Short mmCIF file of C-alpha atoms (C1' of nucleotides) and ligand atoms in Angstrom, two decimals:
data_model
loop_
_atom_site.label_atom_id
_atom_site.label_comp_id
_atom_site.label_asym_id
_atom_site.label_seq_id
_atom_site.Cartn_x
_atom_site.Cartn_y
_atom_site.Cartn_z
CA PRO D 251 -0.11 -0.02 -0.06
CA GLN D 252 1.11 3.74 -0.58
CA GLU D 253 3.55 4.32 2.25
CA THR D 254 1.40 7.71 3.22
CA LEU D 255 -0.76 4.80 4.67
CA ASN D 256 0.98 3.68 7.67
CA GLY D 257 4.43 4.78 6.73
CA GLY D 258 4.81 6.88 9.84
CA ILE D 259 4.17 3.78 12.16
CA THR D 260 6.47 1.48 9.97
CA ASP D 261 9.20 4.07 10.09
CA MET D 262 8.68 4.13 13.76
CA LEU D 263 8.99 0.37 14.26
CA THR D 264 11.85 0.32 11.96
CA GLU D 265 13.69 2.80 14.00
CA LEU D 266 12.86 1.03 17.37
CA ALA D 267 13.85 -2.25 15.74
CA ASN D 268 17.26 -0.93 14.85
CA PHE D 269 17.94 0.52 18.36
CA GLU D 270 17.14 -2.81 19.68
CA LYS D 271 19.61 -4.39 17.53
CA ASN D 272 22.36 -2.02 17.62
CA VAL D 273 22.15 -0.44 21.09
CA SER D 274 20.13 -2.83 23.20
CA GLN D 275 21.63 -6.01 21.52
CA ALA D 276 18.17 -7.87 21.55
CA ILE D 277 18.22 -9.71 18.41
CA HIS D 278 14.89 -10.93 19.23
CA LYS D 279 13.21 -7.66 20.06
CA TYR D 280 14.76 -6.56 16.85
CA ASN D 281 12.92 -8.81 14.71
CA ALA D 282 9.82 -8.65 16.39
CA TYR D 283 9.66 -5.07 15.46
CA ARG D 284 10.86 -5.77 12.10
CA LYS D 285 8.01 -8.45 11.82
CA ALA D 286 5.13 -6.06 12.99
CA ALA D 287 6.46 -3.18 10.43
CA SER D 288 5.96 -5.99 7.73
CA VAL D 289 2.58 -7.03 8.44
CA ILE D 290 1.65 -3.34 8.92
CA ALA D 291 3.57 -2.34 5.64
CA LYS D 292 1.24 -4.88 3.92
CA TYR D 293 -2.00 -3.84 5.73
CA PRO D 294 -4.17 -1.93 3.31
CA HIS D 295 -5.90 0.38 5.62
CA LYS D 296 -4.81 3.69 7.21
CA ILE D 297 -4.74 2.09 10.78
CA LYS D 298 -6.86 4.29 13.27
CA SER D 299 -5.97 2.85 16.57
CA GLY D 300 -3.66 0.77 18.36
CA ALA D 301 -6.43 -1.83 18.85
CA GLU D 302 -6.86 -2.07 15.40
CA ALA D 303 -3.29 -2.90 14.65
CA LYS D 304 -3.17 -5.79 17.55
CA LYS D 305 -5.47 -7.66 15.33
CA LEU D 306 -2.41 -8.52 12.99
CA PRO D 307 -0.11 -11.12 13.67
CA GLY D 308 3.11 -9.84 15.21
CA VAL D 309 1.41 -6.79 16.88
CA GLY D 310 1.12 -7.05 20.44
CA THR D 311 0.07 -4.78 23.43
CA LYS D 312 3.47 -2.70 23.35
CA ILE D 313 3.25 -2.10 19.69
CA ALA D 314 -0.39 -1.33 20.02
CA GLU D 315 0.45 1.26 22.95
CA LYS D 316 3.09 2.99 20.79
CA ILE D 317 0.78 3.07 17.82
CA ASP D 318 -1.96 4.92 20.03
CA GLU D 319 0.64 7.23 21.23
CA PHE D 320 1.94 7.89 17.72
CA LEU D 321 -1.52 8.54 16.43
CA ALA D 322 -2.39 10.77 19.15
CA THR D 323 0.83 12.98 19.14
CA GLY D 324 2.76 12.43 16.06
CA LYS D 325 5.80 10.93 17.78
CA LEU D 326 6.97 8.57 20.61
CA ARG D 327 8.49 10.10 23.59
CA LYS D 328 11.08 7.25 23.85
CA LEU D 329 11.90 7.29 20.23
CA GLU D 330 12.46 11.19 20.41
CA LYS D 331 14.68 10.70 23.53
CA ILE D 332 16.80 7.94 22.01
CA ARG D 333 17.14 9.98 18.74
CA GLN D 334 18.65 13.00 20.66
CA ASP D 335 21.19 10.56 22.69
CA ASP D 336 24.42 10.98 21.34
CA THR D 337 25.90 7.59 22.56
CA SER D 338 22.79 5.85 21.27
CA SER D 339 22.82 7.36 17.69
CA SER D 340 26.56 7.19 17.41
CA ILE D 341 26.48 3.32 18.14
CA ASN D 342 23.41 3.21 15.94
CA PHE D 343 25.14 5.13 13.19
CA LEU D 344 28.49 2.86 13.13
CA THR D 345 26.77 -0.11 12.63
CA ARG D 346 25.86 1.21 9.03
CA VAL D 347 29.53 0.21 8.41
CA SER D 348 29.64 -3.53 7.15
CA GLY D 349 31.80 -5.17 9.85
CA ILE D 350 30.85 -3.03 12.49
CA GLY D 351 28.19 -4.84 14.44
CA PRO D 352 26.75 -3.70 17.77
CA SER D 353 29.73 -4.93 19.82
CA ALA D 354 32.51 -3.27 17.86
CA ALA D 355 30.09 0.07 17.36
CA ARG D 356 29.89 0.22 21.14
CA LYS D 357 33.69 -0.33 21.68
CA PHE D 358 34.29 2.55 19.13
CA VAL D 359 31.84 4.83 20.81
CA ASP D 360 33.18 4.00 24.20
CA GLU D 361 36.48 5.43 22.96
CA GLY D 362 35.48 8.61 21.55
CA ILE D 363 35.02 7.22 18.04
CA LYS D 364 31.58 8.21 16.59
CA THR D 365 31.82 9.32 13.11
CA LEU D 366 33.06 8.13 9.68
CA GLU D 367 35.69 10.77 10.10
CA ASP D 368 36.93 9.29 13.38
CA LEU D 369 36.99 5.91 11.73
CA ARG D 370 38.91 7.18 8.54
CA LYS D 371 41.55 8.73 11.52
CA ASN D 372 41.90 5.38 13.25
CA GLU D 373 42.52 2.72 10.49
CA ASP D 374 44.89 0.79 12.93
CA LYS D 375 41.93 -0.29 14.96
CA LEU D 376 39.80 -1.50 12.13
CA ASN D 377 40.07 -5.26 11.09
CA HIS D 378 40.19 -5.86 7.39
CA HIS D 379 36.51 -6.34 6.67
CA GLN D 380 35.63 -2.94 8.71
CA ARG D 381 38.23 -1.16 6.47
CA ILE D 382 36.40 -2.44 3.46
CA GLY D 383 33.17 -1.36 4.96
CA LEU D 384 34.48 1.96 5.53
CA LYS D 385 36.07 2.44 2.22
CA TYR D 386 32.68 1.63 0.51
CA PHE D 387 30.30 3.07 2.88
CA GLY D 388 28.25 4.94 0.38
CA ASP D 389 28.33 2.41 -2.43
CA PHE D 390 27.15 -0.29 -0.30
CA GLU D 391 23.98 1.58 0.77
CA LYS D 392 22.96 1.94 -2.65
CA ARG D 393 20.58 -0.58 -4.45
CA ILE D 394 21.47 -2.31 -7.62
CA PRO D 395 19.17 -1.76 -10.65
CA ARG D 396 18.30 -5.02 -12.29
CA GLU D 397 20.01 -4.08 -15.73
CA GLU D 398 23.32 -3.82 -13.75
CA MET D 399 22.58 -7.20 -12.20
CA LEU D 400 22.04 -8.64 -15.77
CA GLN D 401 25.23 -6.98 -16.48
CA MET D 402 27.04 -8.74 -13.60
CA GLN D 403 25.24 -12.14 -14.23
CA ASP D 404 26.60 -11.90 -17.74
CA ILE D 405 30.19 -11.34 -16.53
CA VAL D 406 29.87 -14.20 -13.68
CA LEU D 407 28.46 -16.77 -15.97
CA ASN D 408 30.85 -16.19 -18.43
CA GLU D 409 34.04 -16.25 -16.42
CA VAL D 410 32.58 -19.53 -14.50
CA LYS D 411 32.18 -21.28 -17.76
CA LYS D 412 35.60 -20.17 -19.09
CA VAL D 413 37.07 -21.96 -15.86
CA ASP D 414 35.27 -24.93 -16.21
CA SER D 415 32.42 -25.78 -18.55
CA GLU D 416 30.92 -28.34 -16.05
CA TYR D 417 30.22 -25.67 -13.25
CA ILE D 418 26.80 -24.64 -12.85
CA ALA D 419 26.10 -21.19 -11.53
CA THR D 420 22.93 -19.79 -10.45
CA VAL D 421 22.35 -16.19 -9.35
CA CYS D 422 19.68 -16.54 -6.61
CA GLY D 423 18.09 -13.91 -4.55
CA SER D 424 15.03 -11.55 -5.28
CA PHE D 425 16.81 -10.82 -8.38
CA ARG D 426 15.89 -14.46 -9.43
CA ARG D 427 12.16 -13.84 -8.51
CA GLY D 428 12.21 -11.00 -11.13
CA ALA D 429 13.01 -7.93 -8.65
CA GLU D 430 13.64 -4.62 -10.42
CA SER D 431 16.36 -4.04 -8.12
CA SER D 432 18.53 -5.90 -5.48
CA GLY D 433 20.86 -5.18 -2.50
CA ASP D 434 23.57 -7.63 -3.31
CA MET D 435 24.57 -10.29 -5.62
CA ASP D 436 24.22 -14.05 -4.16
CA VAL D 437 25.79 -16.80 -6.49
CA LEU D 438 25.39 -20.33 -5.84
CA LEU D 439 27.96 -22.72 -7.29
CA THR D 440 28.52 -26.36 -7.83
CA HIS D 441 30.35 -28.69 -9.85
CA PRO D 442 29.58 -32.67 -10.48
CA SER D 443 32.93 -33.53 -8.63
CA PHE D 444 31.96 -31.94 -5.50
CA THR D 445 29.24 -34.14 -3.62
CA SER D 446 28.24 -34.82 0.20
CA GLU D 447 30.44 -37.84 0.05
CA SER D 448 33.47 -36.65 -1.88
CA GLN D 449 38.40 -30.46 -4.73
CA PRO D 450 39.51 -27.81 -2.38
CA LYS D 451 39.90 -25.24 -5.24
CA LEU D 452 36.54 -25.27 -6.93
CA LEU D 453 35.70 -22.18 -5.23
CA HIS D 454 39.13 -20.74 -5.46
CA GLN D 455 39.51 -20.99 -9.26
CA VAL D 456 36.19 -19.05 -9.87
CA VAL D 457 37.21 -16.24 -7.41
CA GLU D 458 40.67 -16.18 -9.07
CA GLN D 459 39.30 -15.69 -12.62
CA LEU D 460 36.67 -13.13 -11.43
CA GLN D 461 39.72 -11.01 -9.74
CA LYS D 462 41.79 -11.62 -13.13
CA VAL D 463 39.32 -9.75 -15.30
CA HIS D 464 39.17 -7.49 -12.46
CA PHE D 465 35.50 -7.98 -11.69
CA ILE D 466 35.96 -8.86 -8.08
CA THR D 467 37.84 -5.85 -6.60
CA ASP D 468 37.99 -6.90 -2.73
CA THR D 469 37.73 -9.76 -0.37
CA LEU D 470 35.62 -9.50 2.92
CA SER D 471 36.10 -13.34 3.76
CA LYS D 472 36.81 -16.51 2.04
CA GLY D 473 37.19 -20.03 2.62
CA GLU D 474 36.50 -23.55 0.83
CA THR D 475 32.80 -23.09 0.51
CA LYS D 476 31.81 -19.37 0.95
CA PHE D 477 33.27 -16.19 -0.62
CA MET D 478 31.91 -12.62 0.53
CA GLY D 479 33.46 -9.78 -1.41
CA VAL D 480 33.13 -6.67 -3.16
CA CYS D 481 32.78 -6.31 -7.27
CA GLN D 482 32.30 -3.60 -9.73
CA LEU D 483 30.98 -3.45 -13.47
CA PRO D 484 33.75 -2.07 -15.78
CA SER D 485 33.67 1.49 -16.62
CA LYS D 486 32.45 3.17 -19.91
CA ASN D 487 35.97 4.48 -20.26
CA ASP D 488 34.43 7.85 -20.21
CA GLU D 489 31.16 7.60 -18.07
CA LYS D 490 30.97 7.53 -14.44
CA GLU D 491 32.41 4.61 -12.86
CA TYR D 492 29.72 2.26 -11.53
CA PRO D 493 29.45 1.91 -7.65
CA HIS D 494 31.00 -1.01 -5.74
CA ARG D 495 28.76 -4.01 -5.00
CA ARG D 496 28.42 -6.70 -2.51
CA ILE D 497 28.87 -10.24 -3.83
CA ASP D 498 28.74 -13.66 -2.26
CA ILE D 499 29.49 -16.93 -3.74
CA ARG D 500 28.61 -20.17 -2.36
CA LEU D 501 29.89 -23.62 -3.33
CA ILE D 502 27.45 -26.53 -2.66
CA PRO D 503 27.64 -30.20 -3.12
CA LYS D 504 26.00 -31.00 -6.29
CA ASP D 505 23.33 -33.37 -4.51
CA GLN D 506 22.18 -30.35 -2.35
CA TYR D 507 22.40 -27.67 -5.11
CA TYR D 508 18.95 -27.42 -6.08
CA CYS D 509 17.74 -27.47 -2.27
CA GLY D 510 20.23 -24.78 -2.02
CA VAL D 511 18.91 -22.91 -4.89
CA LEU D 512 15.22 -23.04 -3.81
CA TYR D 513 16.00 -21.78 -0.26
CA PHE D 514 18.24 -18.88 -1.45
CA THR D 515 15.74 -17.92 -4.02
CA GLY D 516 12.99 -17.30 -1.39
CA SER D 517 10.90 -15.38 -0.75
CA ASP D 518 11.37 -15.93 3.04
CA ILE D 519 7.56 -16.23 3.19
CA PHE D 520 7.54 -18.45 0.35
CA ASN D 521 9.81 -20.90 1.88
CA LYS D 522 7.92 -20.89 5.21
CA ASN D 523 4.95 -21.77 3.39
CA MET D 524 6.52 -24.48 1.28
CA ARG D 525 8.15 -25.94 4.42
CA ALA D 526 5.05 -26.00 6.22
CA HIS D 527 3.24 -27.95 3.20
CA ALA D 528 5.81 -30.29 3.15
CA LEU D 529 5.39 -31.61 6.64
CA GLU D 530 1.71 -32.20 6.03
CA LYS D 531 2.59 -34.50 3.39
CA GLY D 532 5.23 -36.39 5.60
CA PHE D 533 8.52 -34.57 4.42
CA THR D 534 11.02 -32.22 5.84
CA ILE D 535 12.65 -29.59 3.71
CA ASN D 536 15.86 -27.53 4.90
CA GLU D 537 18.39 -25.65 2.76
CA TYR D 538 20.56 -28.50 2.29
CA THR D 539 17.96 -31.88 1.87
CA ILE D 540 14.43 -33.13 1.65
CA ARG D 541 13.88 -36.05 3.84
CA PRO D 542 10.84 -38.33 4.44
CA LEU D 543 9.38 -38.69 7.90
CA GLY D 544 8.21 -41.86 9.65
CA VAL D 545 4.86 -42.00 11.35
CA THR D 546 7.01 -41.33 14.54
CA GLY D 547 8.48 -38.22 13.14
CA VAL D 548 12.03 -39.72 12.63
CA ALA D 549 13.50 -38.31 9.33
CA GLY D 550 14.96 -40.66 6.85
CA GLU D 551 17.31 -40.46 4.19
CA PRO D 552 17.72 -37.56 1.88
CA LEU D 553 15.85 -38.04 -1.28
CA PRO D 554 17.46 -37.74 -4.55
CA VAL D 555 17.04 -34.17 -5.92
CA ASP D 556 18.44 -33.44 -9.58
CA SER D 557 16.15 -30.27 -10.08
CA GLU D 558 14.09 -27.63 -8.29
CA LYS D 559 10.99 -29.63 -9.85
CA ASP D 560 11.78 -32.77 -8.07
CA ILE D 561 11.22 -30.86 -4.88
CA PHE D 562 8.07 -29.93 -5.83
CA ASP D 563 7.08 -33.34 -7.20
CA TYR D 564 7.93 -34.98 -3.83
CA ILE D 565 5.41 -32.63 -1.97
CA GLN D 566 2.78 -33.06 -4.66
CA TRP D 567 2.92 -29.28 -5.83
CA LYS D 568 2.72 -27.74 -8.99
CA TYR D 569 6.24 -26.22 -9.94
CA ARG D 570 6.10 -22.36 -9.26
CA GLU D 571 8.18 -20.17 -11.56
CA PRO D 572 10.58 -17.97 -9.46
CA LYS D 573 8.61 -15.01 -10.56
CA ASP D 574 5.61 -16.51 -8.57
CA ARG D 575 7.38 -17.21 -5.47
CA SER D 576 6.67 -13.99 -3.54
CA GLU D 577 4.52 -16.19 -1.01
"C1'" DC O 879 4.86 -18.44 32.95
"C1'" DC O 880 8.48 -18.81 30.28
"C1'" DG O 881 11.40 -20.64 26.56
"C1'" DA O 882 11.70 -19.89 21.13
"C1'" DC O 883 12.46 -16.66 18.17
"C1'" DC O 884 17.33 -19.96 11.48
"C1'" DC O 885 26.15 -21.53 10.04
"C1'" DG O 886 31.07 -20.39 7.41
"C1'" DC O 887 34.62 -17.61 8.20
"C1'" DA O 888 37.88 -14.06 10.86
"C1'" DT O 889 39.36 -13.28 14.93
"C1'" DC O 890 39.61 -13.57 19.89
"C1'" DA O 891 39.89 -15.93 24.50
"C1'" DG O 892 41.74 -19.31 26.70
"C1'" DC O 893 44.68 -22.71 27.34
"C1'" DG I 698 50.63 -23.94 18.85
"C1'" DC I 699 45.49 -25.80 19.18
"C1'" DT I 700 40.36 -25.81 20.40
"C1'" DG I 701 36.41 -23.36 21.22
"C1'" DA I 702 33.75 -18.91 21.89
"C1'" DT I 703 32.19 -14.97 19.97
"C1'" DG I 704 31.07 -11.20 16.55
"C1'" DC I 705 29.41 -10.59 12.04
"C1'" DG I 706 26.45 -11.09 8.02
"C1'" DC I 707 23.96 -13.50 5.87
"C1'" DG H 247 8.51 -7.74 21.70
"C1'" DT H 248 5.26 -11.38 20.29
"C1'" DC H 249 3.60 -15.64 20.31
"C1'" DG H 250 1.94 -20.06 22.23
"C1'" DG H 251 2.56 -24.82 24.84
NA1 NA R 2274 -1.55 -9.53 17.58
NA1 NA R 2275 27.49 -3.28 10.41
NA1 NA R 2276 35.56 -27.84 -20.86
#
DNA sequence: CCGACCCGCATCAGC
DNA sequence: GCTGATGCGC
DNA sequence: GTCGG
């Protein structure tokens, strides 16, 4: 619905959520507030009272009370107070740096370090991830237009195939569901020589090639199965350079690939529904496998999965195109 | 009432 | 030095 | 903070 509907309320709840996560270090309070903000962002009516909102799943008494106060006054005293609190807004700001979580932001603010400029002055005190997150502070908060995501997909698929024509790579995420923009690029990768019951350089060779053509510009972390880093589309040689973007690459065993693709394609609501349905039919689905249940509830051995459709076949579901996996 | 609320890698704490 | 905990982002 | 066993 139009933000102007309940946008003030969902803005309030989101701010409350960020303070729970970054200042109170209460991840569960944080996600409750986000949950509430979501179910209200979808509600197609200008809420008139907290009691109206409490009918929705995820809205309890506390959030009903804060909505009442927001409607009667246009603000929340506690939010107003926390907004003007130097330490709290500084801690909350520093977590916008990737690699600075609530704990690091707390230690920095406890030492006088409150601003980007303060961070730029104290490189010595930042690990490698945090230095990168500082270096690209602005670029990382930008969304990625789908056309750029396609340009990025082109490069990734090409270089992967150049390394080994037997690799399979799938750009999952909202992008695969058709989204007009993305926040990062999530690449799922596999190779028939890598299974659950089976090379330590399959991921490395792909990362290496993507660095050699100067697509991957920085590394946040890299191991045998998970790469998190930075990439950038090549400049038009006279146009303004593209912003740097976050990219993750995961190597998954071939026998768990399509389960992984299903999961990391989402949406989160969709996955929940799918999993819910699969239990009804005597199956359990996680990000790795689908396994049958016994009458007693004991899971059996993972079932052979050679395509996304196979998952749907097991649970007696018509295959849903990624475009139609919004829920 | 009161516990649940979804792991790979970098780095630290401890030994 | 090795092993486990924690922070972080997902 | 919200839910539910
Ligand atoms: Na409710
Ligand atoms: Na952060
Ligand atoms: Na080949």
